[PDB]
């Protein structure tokens, strides 16, 4: 019965969008961090604490969509 399969499918698309959203977002943010380190290697521990202030916000909305993706997997 199609009810079961299309719930499986709805998680899989929702999961792929959340995977792309996170992976690209922190890739971009991490690239500017590595430019800063190559330009300015004295500050890299300071920049490291900045990069992680920002990184958690990029992850926050994609992780919600993973939470619904895993609930639609589970139920």
């Amino acid at each position: 019965n199609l009810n079961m399969d299309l719930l499986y499918m709805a998680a899989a698309v929702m999961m792929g969008l959340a995977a792309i959203g996170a992976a690209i977002g922190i890739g971009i943010l991490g690239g500017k961090f590595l430019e800063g380190a190559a330009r300015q290697p004295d500050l890299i521990p300071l920049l490291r604490t900045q990069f992680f202030i920002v990184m958690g916000l990029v992850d926050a909305i994609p992780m919600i969509a993973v939470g619904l993706g895993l609930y639609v997997m589970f139920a």
Partner: protein, 57 residues
């Protein structure tokens, strides 16, 4: 700074030819000012050329 580069004028190399800019008067009556300077130049210009270095002026 940390943003240090390589440039021909900043890099260090062994002398195989040497150059001098030299300043002198256009007018006499200055006493020995020119001659004392030229004597000091002649000593160092001799010292490098004994190392086989062609001097240039």
């Amino acid at each position: 700074g940390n943003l240090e580069y390589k440039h021909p004028y900043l890099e260090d190399r062994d002398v195989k030819r040497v150059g001098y800019l030299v300043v002198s008067t256009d007018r006499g009556l200055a006493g020995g000012l020119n001659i004392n300077l030229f004597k000091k130049l002649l000593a160092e210009m001799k010292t490098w050329t004994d190392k086989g270095v062609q001097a240039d002026l």
